[PDB]
Short mmCIF file of all heavy atoms in Angstrom, two decimals:
data_model
loop_
_atom_site.label_atom_id
_atom_site.label_comp_id
_atom_site.label_asym_id
_atom_site.label_seq_id
_atom_site.Cartn_x
_atom_site.Cartn_y
_atom_site.Cartn_z
N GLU I 1534 -0.17 39.20 -17.53
CA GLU I 1534 -0.82 40.42 -17.12
C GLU I 1534 0.05 41.21 -16.17
O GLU I 1534 -0.28 42.41 -15.90
CB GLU I 1534 -2.12 40.03 -16.35
CG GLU I 1534 -3.18 39.37 -17.25
CD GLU I 1534 -4.40 38.91 -16.49
OE1 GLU I 1534 -4.31 38.96 -15.25
OE2 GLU I 1534 -5.31 38.43 -17.15
N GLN I 1535 1.13 40.66 -15.69
CA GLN I 1535 2.03 41.35 -14.80
C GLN I 1535 2.87 42.43 -15.69
O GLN I 1535 3.32 42.04 -16.69
CB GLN I 1535 2.94 40.47 -14.11
CG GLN I 1535 2.34 39.58 -13.01
CD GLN I 1535 1.59 40.41 -11.93
OE1 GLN I 1535 0.36 40.43 -11.91
NE2 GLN I 1535 2.41 41.05 -11.14
N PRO I 1536 3.01 43.60 -15.16
CA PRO I 1536 3.83 44.57 -15.87
C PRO I 1536 5.30 44.32 -15.81
O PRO I 1536 5.80 43.85 -14.84
CB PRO I 1536 3.45 45.93 -15.20
CG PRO I 1536 3.11 45.51 -13.79
CD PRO I 1536 2.44 44.17 -13.89
N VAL I 1537 6.06 44.71 -16.83
CA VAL I 1537 7.51 44.62 -16.85
C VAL I 1537 8.06 45.63 -16.01
O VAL I 1537 7.89 46.85 -16.27
CB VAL I 1537 7.95 44.59 -18.30
CG1 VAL I 1537 9.53 44.59 -18.30
CG2 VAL I 1537 7.55 43.43 -19.16
N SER I 1538 8.89 45.19 -15.01
CA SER I 1538 9.39 46.18 -14.06
C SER I 1538 10.61 46.79 -14.58
O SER I 1538 11.59 46.19 -14.93
CB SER I 1538 9.72 45.42 -12.78
OG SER I 1538 10.31 46.36 -11.79
N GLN I 1539 10.59 48.19 -14.69
CA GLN I 1539 11.63 48.98 -15.11
C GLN I 1539 12.66 49.25 -13.95
O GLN I 1539 12.24 49.79 -12.90
CB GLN I 1539 11.16 50.30 -15.63
CG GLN I 1539 10.39 50.26 -16.93
CD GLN I 1539 11.21 49.69 -18.05
OE1 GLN I 1539 10.98 48.63 -18.56
NE2 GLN I 1539 12.17 50.48 -18.55
N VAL I 1540 13.84 48.84 -14.07
CA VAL I 1540 14.86 49.22 -13.03
C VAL I 1540 16.04 49.90 -13.76
O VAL I 1540 16.23 49.79 -14.88
CB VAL I 1540 15.42 48.03 -12.21
CG1 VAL I 1540 14.30 47.37 -11.39
CG2 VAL I 1540 15.99 47.01 -13.13
N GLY I 1541 16.78 50.71 -13.00
CA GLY I 1541 18.02 51.37 -13.43
C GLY I 1541 19.19 50.64 -13.14
O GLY I 1541 20.31 51.15 -13.38
N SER I 1542 19.17 49.43 -12.58
CA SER I 1542 20.39 48.65 -12.29
C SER I 1542 20.76 47.78 -13.45
O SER I 1542 20.01 47.52 -14.40
CB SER I 1542 20.13 47.81 -10.96
OG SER I 1542 21.20 47.05 -10.67
N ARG I 1543 21.96 47.17 -13.25
CA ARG I 1543 22.39 46.30 -14.29
C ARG I 1543 22.07 44.82 -13.95
O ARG I 1543 21.81 43.98 -14.79
CB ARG I 1543 23.87 46.39 -14.47
CG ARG I 1543 24.57 45.50 -15.52
CD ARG I 1543 26.07 45.90 -15.52
NE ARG I 1543 26.79 44.92 -16.40
CZ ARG I 1543 28.12 45.03 -16.69
NH1 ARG I 1543 28.79 45.99 -16.10
NH2 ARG I 1543 28.76 44.13 -17.35
N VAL I 1544 22.01 44.50 -12.65
CA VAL I 1544 21.64 43.13 -12.03
C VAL I 1544 20.68 43.39 -11.01
O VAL I 1544 20.83 44.13 -10.03
CB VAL I 1544 22.91 42.47 -11.45
CG1 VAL I 1544 22.52 41.23 -10.73
CG2 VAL I 1544 23.90 42.09 -12.60
N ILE I 1545 19.50 42.65 -11.20
CA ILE I 1545 18.36 42.82 -10.25
C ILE I 1545 18.19 41.58 -9.46
O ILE I 1545 18.36 40.46 -10.02
CB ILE I 1545 17.02 43.16 -11.05
CG1 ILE I 1545 15.98 43.57 -10.13
CG2 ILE I 1545 16.62 42.13 -11.99
CD1 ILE I 1545 16.20 44.82 -9.22
N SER I 1546 17.84 41.70 -8.19
CA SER I 1546 17.70 40.51 -7.40
C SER I 1546 16.10 40.22 -7.18
O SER I 1546 15.42 41.29 -6.92
CB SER I 1546 18.40 40.66 -5.98
OG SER I 1546 17.79 41.73 -5.30
N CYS I 1547 15.73 39.00 -7.15
CA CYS I 1547 14.28 38.69 -7.06
C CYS I 1547 14.13 37.60 -5.98
O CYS I 1547 14.92 36.54 -6.15
CB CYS I 1547 13.77 38.26 -8.37
SG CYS I 1547 11.93 38.02 -8.29
N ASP I 1548 13.33 37.74 -5.10
CA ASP I 1548 12.87 36.63 -4.16
C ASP I 1548 11.38 36.41 -4.19
O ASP I 1548 10.96 35.59 -3.42
CB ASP I 1548 13.27 37.06 -2.75
CG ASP I 1548 12.80 38.41 -2.26
OD1 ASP I 1548 12.21 39.13 -3.08
OD2 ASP I 1548 13.05 38.71 -1.11
N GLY I 1549 10.58 37.07 -4.99
CA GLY I 1549 9.18 36.82 -5.21
C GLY I 1549 8.32 37.57 -4.35
O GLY I 1549 7.11 37.41 -4.40
N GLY I 1550 8.85 38.41 -3.43
CA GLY I 1550 8.10 39.13 -2.42
C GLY I 1550 7.68 38.30 -1.25
O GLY I 1550 7.35 37.14 -1.37
N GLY I 1551 7.82 38.88 -0.01
CA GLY I 1551 7.49 38.16 1.23
C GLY I 1551 8.82 37.73 1.95
O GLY I 1551 8.69 37.22 3.10
N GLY I 1552 9.96 37.88 1.35
CA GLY I 1552 11.24 37.47 2.04
C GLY I 1552 11.40 35.96 2.04
O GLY I 1552 11.66 35.35 1.06
N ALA I 1553 11.22 35.40 3.28
CA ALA I 1553 11.26 33.93 3.42
C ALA I 1553 9.92 33.28 2.96
O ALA I 1553 9.81 32.09 2.96
CB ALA I 1553 11.55 33.55 4.83
N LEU I 1554 8.83 34.08 2.63
CA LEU I 1554 7.58 33.56 2.14
C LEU I 1554 7.64 33.38 0.65
O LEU I 1554 6.64 32.84 0.05
CB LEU I 1554 6.48 34.50 2.54
CG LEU I 1554 6.26 34.66 4.01
CD1 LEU I 1554 5.17 35.72 4.26
CD2 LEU I 1554 5.86 33.33 4.61
N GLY I 1555 8.69 33.80 -0.09
CA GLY I 1555 8.80 33.64 -1.52
C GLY I 1555 9.78 32.54 -1.86
O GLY I 1555 9.93 31.47 -1.17
N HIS I 1556 10.43 32.65 -2.98
CA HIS I 1556 11.37 31.70 -3.56
C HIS I 1556 12.81 32.14 -3.15
O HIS I 1556 13.02 33.24 -2.55
CB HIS I 1556 11.19 31.66 -5.09
CG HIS I 1556 11.56 32.89 -5.81
ND1 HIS I 1556 12.86 33.25 -6.18
CD2 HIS I 1556 10.73 33.90 -6.32
CE1 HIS I 1556 12.74 34.43 -6.90
NE2 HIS I 1556 11.53 34.75 -7.03
N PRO I 1557 13.80 31.32 -3.34
CA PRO I 1557 15.22 31.77 -3.09
C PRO I 1557 15.59 32.92 -3.96
O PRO I 1557 15.11 33.08 -5.11
CB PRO I 1557 16.01 30.55 -3.48
CG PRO I 1557 15.18 29.33 -3.23
CD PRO I 1557 13.81 29.84 -3.52
N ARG I 1558 16.40 33.84 -3.39
CA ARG I 1558 16.77 35.04 -4.02
C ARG I 1558 17.75 34.86 -5.05
O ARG I 1558 18.91 34.39 -4.70
CB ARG I 1558 17.29 36.10 -2.93
CG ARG I 1558 17.40 37.44 -3.54
CD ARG I 1558 17.90 38.43 -2.46
NE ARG I 1558 19.23 38.25 -1.92
CZ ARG I 1558 19.52 37.90 -0.75
NH1 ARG I 1558 18.49 37.81 0.20
NH2 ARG I 1558 20.73 37.71 -0.36
N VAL I 1559 17.43 35.17 -6.34
CA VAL I 1559 18.31 34.88 -7.44
C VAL I 1559 18.55 36.23 -8.19
O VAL I 1559 17.84 37.22 -8.09
CB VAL I 1559 17.74 33.86 -8.38
CG1 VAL I 1559 17.69 32.53 -7.80
CG2 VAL I 1559 16.31 34.29 -8.91
N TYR I 1560 19.70 36.31 -8.90
CA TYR I 1560 20.22 37.51 -9.46
C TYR I 1560 20.12 37.37 -11.00
O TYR I 1560 20.54 36.33 -11.57
CB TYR I 1560 21.70 37.68 -9.06
CG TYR I 1560 21.82 38.03 -7.57
CD1 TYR I 1560 21.92 37.08 -6.59
CD2 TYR I 1560 21.72 39.37 -7.14
CE1 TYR I 1560 22.04 37.43 -5.27
CE2 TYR I 1560 21.83 39.72 -5.84
CZ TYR I 1560 21.99 38.73 -4.87
OH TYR I 1560 22.15 38.96 -3.58
N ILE I 1561 19.57 38.42 -11.62
CA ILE I 1561 19.15 38.43 -13.06
C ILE I 1561 19.95 39.47 -13.67
O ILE I 1561 19.93 40.57 -13.27
CB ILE I 1561 17.65 38.62 -13.14
CG1 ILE I 1561 16.84 37.65 -12.36
CG2 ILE I 1561 17.26 38.66 -14.59
CD1 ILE I 1561 15.44 37.95 -12.25
N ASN I 1562 20.52 39.15 -14.74
CA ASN I 1562 21.37 40.01 -15.59
C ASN I 1562 20.40 40.68 -16.64
O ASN I 1562 19.55 40.02 -17.16
CB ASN I 1562 22.51 39.38 -16.37
CG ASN I 1562 23.45 40.31 -16.92
OD1 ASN I 1562 23.33 41.62 -16.71
ND2 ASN I 1562 24.42 39.84 -17.61
N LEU I 1563 20.58 41.96 -16.89
CA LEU I 1563 19.79 42.74 -17.76
C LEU I 1563 20.56 43.47 -18.79
O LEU I 1563 20.31 44.56 -19.20
CB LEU I 1563 18.92 43.74 -16.90
CG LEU I 1563 18.00 43.17 -15.93
CD1 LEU I 1563 17.28 44.20 -15.05
CD2 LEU I 1563 16.94 42.26 -16.51
N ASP I 1564 21.58 42.77 -19.32
CA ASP I 1564 22.45 43.34 -20.36
C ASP I 1564 21.80 43.34 -21.68
O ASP I 1564 22.07 44.23 -22.49
CB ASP I 1564 23.81 42.65 -20.40
CG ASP I 1564 24.67 42.93 -19.23
OD1 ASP I 1564 24.59 44.13 -18.68
OD2 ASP I 1564 25.52 42.06 -18.85
N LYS I 1565 20.97 42.35 -21.99
CA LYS I 1565 20.19 42.27 -23.19
C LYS I 1565 19.21 43.41 -23.27
O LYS I 1565 18.14 43.28 -22.47
CB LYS I 1565 19.60 40.92 -23.34
CG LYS I 1565 20.55 39.68 -23.57
CD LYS I 1565 19.79 38.41 -23.87
CE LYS I 1565 20.56 37.21 -23.84
NZ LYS I 1565 21.50 37.29 -25.00
N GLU I 1566 19.35 44.32 -24.12
CA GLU I 1566 18.40 45.39 -24.24
C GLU I 1566 17.20 44.88 -25.08
O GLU I 1566 16.12 45.53 -25.07
CB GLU I 1566 18.97 46.63 -24.86
CG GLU I 1566 20.08 47.27 -24.09
CD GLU I 1566 19.51 47.99 -22.82
OE1 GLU I 1566 18.33 48.45 -22.83
OE2 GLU I 1566 20.12 47.99 -21.75
N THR I 1567 17.36 43.88 -25.87
CA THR I 1567 16.29 43.28 -26.63
C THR I 1567 15.24 42.54 -25.76
O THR I 1567 14.04 42.88 -25.77
CB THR I 1567 16.81 42.27 -27.60
OG1 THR I 1567 17.70 42.98 -28.54
CG2 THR I 1567 15.71 41.67 -28.40
N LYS I 1568 15.76 41.62 -24.84
CA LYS I 1568 14.92 40.72 -24.09
C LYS I 1568 14.90 41.07 -22.63
O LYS I 1568 15.91 41.47 -22.03
CB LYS I 1568 15.44 39.32 -24.27
CG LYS I 1568 14.56 38.18 -23.72
CD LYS I 1568 15.15 36.82 -24.13
CE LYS I 1568 16.43 36.52 -23.26
NZ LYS I 1568 16.06 36.34 -21.85
N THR I 1569 13.71 40.94 -22.05
CA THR I 1569 13.59 41.16 -20.57
C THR I 1569 14.12 39.97 -19.81
O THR I 1569 14.05 38.91 -20.24
CB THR I 1569 12.09 41.41 -20.13
OG1 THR I 1569 11.30 40.33 -20.55
CG2 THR I 1569 11.58 42.61 -20.91
N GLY I 1570 14.55 40.28 -18.54
CA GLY I 1570 15.09 39.25 -17.74
C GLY I 1570 14.06 38.63 -16.93
O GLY I 1570 13.58 39.12 -15.84
N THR I 1571 13.50 37.44 -17.28
CA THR I 1571 12.43 36.79 -16.61
C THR I 1571 13.08 35.90 -15.47
O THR I 1571 13.97 35.17 -15.66
CB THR I 1571 11.64 35.83 -17.59
OG1 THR I 1571 11.08 36.69 -18.62
CG2 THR I 1571 10.61 35.16 -16.92
N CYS I 1572 12.46 36.07 -14.29
CA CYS I 1572 12.92 35.23 -13.16
C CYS I 1572 12.47 33.78 -13.39
O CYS I 1572 11.45 33.48 -13.86
CB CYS I 1572 12.20 35.82 -11.87
SG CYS I 1572 12.68 34.93 -10.40
N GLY I 1573 13.45 32.90 -13.03
CA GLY I 1573 13.22 31.51 -13.26
C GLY I 1573 12.31 30.82 -12.34
O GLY I 1573 11.75 29.76 -12.67
N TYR I 1574 11.87 31.49 -11.21
CA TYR I 1574 11.02 30.94 -10.24
C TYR I 1574 9.60 31.53 -10.37
O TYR I 1574 8.61 30.85 -10.53
CB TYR I 1574 11.54 31.28 -8.81
CG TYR I 1574 12.71 30.43 -8.38
CD1 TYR I 1574 14.01 30.90 -8.64
CD2 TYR I 1574 12.50 29.29 -7.72
CE1 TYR I 1574 15.10 30.19 -8.19
CE2 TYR I 1574 13.65 28.54 -7.27
CZ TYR I 1574 14.86 28.92 -7.55
OH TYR I 1574 16.04 28.24 -7.12
N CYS I 1575 9.47 32.89 -10.33
CA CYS I 1575 8.24 33.56 -10.25
C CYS I 1575 7.74 34.04 -11.57
O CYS I 1575 6.49 34.37 -11.67
CB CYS I 1575 8.32 34.71 -9.25
SG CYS I 1575 9.45 36.06 -9.76
N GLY I 1576 8.53 34.12 -12.67
CA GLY I 1576 8.19 34.60 -13.90
C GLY I 1576 8.00 36.18 -14.08
O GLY I 1576 7.66 36.57 -15.13
N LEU I 1577 8.36 36.88 -12.99
CA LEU I 1577 8.31 38.34 -13.06
C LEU I 1577 9.49 38.71 -13.86
O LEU I 1577 10.65 38.52 -13.46
CB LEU I 1577 8.30 38.97 -11.67
CG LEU I 1577 7.03 38.83 -10.89
CD1 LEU I 1577 7.31 39.45 -9.52
CD2 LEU I 1577 5.86 39.33 -11.60
N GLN I 1578 9.23 39.43 -14.97
CA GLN I 1578 10.36 39.84 -15.89
C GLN I 1578 10.71 41.27 -15.76
O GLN I 1578 9.85 42.11 -15.54
CB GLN I 1578 9.95 39.54 -17.42
CG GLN I 1578 8.64 40.13 -17.78
CD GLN I 1578 8.16 39.68 -19.18
OE1 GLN I 1578 8.88 38.92 -19.83
NE2 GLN I 1578 7.01 40.02 -19.65
N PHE I 1579 11.94 41.53 -15.82
CA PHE I 1579 12.57 42.85 -15.48
C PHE I 1579 13.23 43.49 -16.78
O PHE I 1579 13.74 42.64 -17.51
CB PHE I 1579 13.57 42.70 -14.31
CG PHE I 1579 12.95 42.33 -13.02
CD1 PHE I 1579 12.95 40.94 -12.78
CD2 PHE I 1579 12.33 43.17 -12.18
CE1 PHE I 1579 12.26 40.50 -11.58
CE2 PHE I 1579 11.90 42.66 -11.00
CZ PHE I 1579 11.80 41.41 -10.71
N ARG I 1580 13.29 44.76 -16.91
CA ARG I 1580 13.89 45.42 -17.90
C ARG I 1580 14.71 46.59 -17.39
O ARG I 1580 14.22 47.29 -16.56
CB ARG I 1580 12.95 45.90 -18.93
CG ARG I 1580 13.56 46.38 -20.21
CD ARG I 1580 12.61 47.01 -21.24
NE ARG I 1580 11.66 46.02 -21.76
CZ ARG I 1580 10.30 46.10 -21.62
NH1 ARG I 1580 9.79 47.05 -20.92
NH2 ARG I 1580 9.59 45.12 -22.17
N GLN I 1581 15.93 46.67 -17.88
CA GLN I 1581 16.80 47.82 -17.63
C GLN I 1581 16.37 48.96 -18.49
O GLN I 1581 16.22 48.82 -19.67
CB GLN I 1581 18.27 47.51 -17.77
CG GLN I 1581 19.21 48.65 -17.34
CD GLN I 1581 20.64 48.36 -17.60
OE1 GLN I 1581 20.98 47.26 -18.02
NE2 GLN I 1581 21.57 49.18 -17.15
N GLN I 1582 16.19 50.22 -17.88
CA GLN I 1582 15.63 51.26 -18.64
C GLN I 1582 16.66 52.08 -19.44
O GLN I 1582 16.46 53.18 -19.87
CB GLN I 1582 14.98 52.23 -17.68
CG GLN I 1582 15.89 52.93 -16.63
CD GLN I 1582 15.08 53.71 -15.62
OE1 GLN I 1582 13.90 53.75 -15.67
NE2 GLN I 1582 15.88 54.28 -14.62
N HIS I 1583 17.89 51.50 -19.73
CA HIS I 1583 18.87 52.13 -20.50
C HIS I 1583 19.51 51.10 -21.48
O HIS I 1583 19.53 51.17 -22.65
CB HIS I 1583 19.98 52.72 -19.62
CG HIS I 1583 19.44 53.92 -18.87
ND1 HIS I 1583 19.24 55.26 -19.63
CD2 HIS I 1583 19.06 54.13 -17.67
CE1 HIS I 1583 18.75 56.09 -18.67
NE2 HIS I 1583 18.70 55.51 -17.46
#
Side-chain angles (χ1 to χ4, degrees):
Chain I
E1534 298 173 353
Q1535 292 300 112
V1537 175
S1538 177
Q1539 294 294 111
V1540 297
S1542 178
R1543 182 177 171 181
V1544 170
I1545 188 66
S1546 65
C1547 186
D1548 55 353
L1554 298 176
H1556 64 86
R1558 190 176 68 243
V1559 294
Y1560 291 89
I1561 302 166
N1562 194 2
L1563 300 175
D1564 288 330
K1565 293 185 186 293
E1566 295 293 327
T1567 299
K1568 186 176 73 68
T1569 60
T1571 301
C1572 182
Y1574 288 87
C1575 63
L1577 294 178
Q1578 55 186 356
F1579 296 92
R1580 188 184 294 116
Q1581 185 178 4
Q1582 63 186 359
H1583 292 283

